[PDB]
């Protein structure tokens, strides 16, 4: 996150911090107790599976006060059509062991009805994307969570506005941009997996999730999100189903 | 020459003479160029998401209806949602 | 379908009409309007027009600029094809009226220019209310600068 506020303790309830052995990997978002959204391509490079954390709660990442919840990631699902180091159907759904236990820290986001989402959200114009994730292109990373306002853009506007750049992926039916070009702030690579989150009417709901950009806030470009409101029937669908047997799952998609 | 002789305006609003052109003051309840269209019928989703708090069902030559995701339960004006539970998805305590 | 086309306001003393091409051959427009960091509001749902007032809209707070997008949808039925006008700042670009109460209506009343330019208005020489041909002027405007002379009268 380049550009952002430091977001104050509590505020982003319900950001997830994802680790492999302890190392720093992802974020990703409580859409449910037992339930974590993420972004696929988090885990390209994946050879511990068993060893996956997820930490609701999460502050500061020095500092270990008595709000963080540790929980084990049980199983990581994605589409069937997502292809390993391709930034196209980018979106993870994970169960966790066992669930976390909402506080007044740890909170989940509102997964919402997919015309709901289409109509209606996809038109508040400014949303937060969060997260531990880079401060600048090949900088440091966040200590604390990290918070940043941005501007969505209807996907004609984005290539309008974008410049374009010999063999970059191609916006698709199942992204957005959002953000800025005057390259002044933007999502960055801590912070894949992690909430766009959409206020309306006193209430937050999940729209986007961070996903992949040409570096980060770099002049002409925007920052690219999975369109959360693709995967909505996929998603529910799945959390209804019954439990399958293995760790890593490819579900039929849609 | 005026062109509001030619009676353009409709729904009682006052019409105003310009140069090859004219205007059209509505009363509050009405807007277009000359005041013809009814703002109550919109009582539609895509029209604000028919002033629901959270979610919003068009029918059939009929009122839209509201509803709540889970967690959430509709008040007695049928717009509101209200919580059924202790955290609710997608508020934020330290702040409520 | 065909998206719109030579987008274009035509603003009269606030009264603000949006403006477009082409006629709908088996194709419904919608219209949305927003202010620059606003949300987007819809209006004009399906119409076969080729126009949309949006005086109400951009009359709750003139000194904004707007910008407007018009979507083509095929009749009887992943984001629709839109285009954009271009910016719209009432308070600097609406046309004057040809003179003798505008359309902002605070409260139930249209407001009078005086009541929207204050001090930025003179006529032509006089900074006050007062063969006689007058025009309205703003000294502060880039463009649309001045209204047409009133009916001449001796
Ligand atoms: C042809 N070649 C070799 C290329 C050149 C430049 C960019 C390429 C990208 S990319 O545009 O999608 N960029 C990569 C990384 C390269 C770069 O940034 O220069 C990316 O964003 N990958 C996904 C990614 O790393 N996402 C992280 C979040 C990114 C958020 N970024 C922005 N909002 N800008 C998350 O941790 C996973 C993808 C594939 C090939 C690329
Ligand atoms: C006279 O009335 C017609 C229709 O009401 C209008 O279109 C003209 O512009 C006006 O002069
Ligand atoms: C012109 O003003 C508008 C508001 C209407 O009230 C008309 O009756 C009047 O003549
Ligand atoms: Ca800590
Ligand atoms: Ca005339
Ligand atoms: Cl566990």
Same mark, same amino acid.
């Given at each position: 996150i380049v550009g952002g506020k430091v977001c104050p303790k509590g505020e982003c309830p319900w950001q997830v911090l994802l680790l492999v052995n302890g190392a720093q990997l992802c974020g990703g978002t409580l859409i449910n107790t037992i339930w974590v959204v993420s972004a696929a391509h988090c885990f390209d490079k994946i050879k511990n599976w068993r060893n996956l954390i997820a930490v609701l709660g999460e502050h500061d990442l020095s500092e270990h006060d008595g709000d963080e919840q540790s929980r084990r990631v049980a199983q990581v699902i994605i589409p069937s059509t997502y292809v390993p180091g391709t930034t196209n159907h980018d979106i993870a759904l994970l169960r966790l062991h066992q669930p976390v236990v909402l506080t007044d820290h740890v909170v989940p986001l509102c997964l919402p009805e997919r015309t709901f989402s289409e109509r209606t959200l996809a038109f508040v114009r400014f949303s937060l994307v969060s997260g531990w994730g880079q401060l600048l292109d090949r900088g440091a990373t966040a200590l604390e969570l990290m918070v940043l306002n941005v501007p969505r853009l209807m996907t004609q506007d984005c290539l309008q506005q974008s410049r374009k750049v010999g063999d970059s992926p191609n916006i698709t039916e199942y992204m957005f941009c959002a953000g800025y070009s005057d390259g002044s702030k933007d999502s960055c690579k801590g912070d894949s997996g992690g909430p766009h989150a959409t206020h309306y009417r006193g209430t937050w709901y999940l729209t986007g999730i961070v996903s992949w950009g $040409? =570096? /980060?806030? @770099?002049? =002409?470009h925007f920052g690219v999100y999975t369109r959360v409101s693709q995967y909505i029937e996929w998603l529910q669908k799945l959390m209804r189903s019954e439990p399958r047997p293995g760790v890593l799952l490819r579900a039929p998609f849609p | 020459g005026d062109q509001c002789a030619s009676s353009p305006c409709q729904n009682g609003g006052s019409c105003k003479d310009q140069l090859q052109s004219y205007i059209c003051f509505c009363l509050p309840a009405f807007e277009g160029r000359? /005041?013809? @269209?009814?703002? +109550? +019928? $919109?009582?539609? /989703?895509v029209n604000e998401n028919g002033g629901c708090e959270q979610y919003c069902s068009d029918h059939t030559g009929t009122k839209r209806s509201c509803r709540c995701h889970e967690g959430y339960s509709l008040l007695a004006d049928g717009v509101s949602c209200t919580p059924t539970v202790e955290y609710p998805c997608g508020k934020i305590p330290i702040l409520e | 379908t065909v998206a719109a086309y030579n987008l274009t306001w035509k603003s009269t003393n606030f009264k603000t009409i949006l403006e477009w091409e082409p006629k709908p051959v088996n194709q419904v427009y919608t219209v949305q309007i927003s202010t620059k960091s606003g949300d987007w509001k819809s209006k004009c749902f399906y119409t076969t027009d080729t126009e949309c007032d949006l005086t109400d809209e951009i009359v709750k707070d003139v000194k904004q600029t707007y910008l407007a997008r018009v979507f083509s949808y095929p009749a009887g039925n992943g984001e629709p094809l839109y285009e954009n006008s271009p910016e719209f700042t009432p308070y600097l670009e609406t046309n004057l009226g040809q003179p003798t109460r505008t359309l902002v209506r605070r409260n139930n009343t249209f407001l009078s220019l005086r009541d929207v330019f204050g001090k930025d208005l003179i006529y032509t020489k006089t900074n006050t209310n007062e063969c006689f041909s007058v025009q309205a002027v703003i000294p502060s405007r880039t463009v649309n600068r001045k209204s047409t002379d009133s009916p001449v009268e001796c």
């Open positions: $040409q =570096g /980060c806030a @770099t002049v =002409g | 000359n /005041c013809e @269209t009814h703002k +109550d +019928d $919109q009582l539609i /989703c | -």
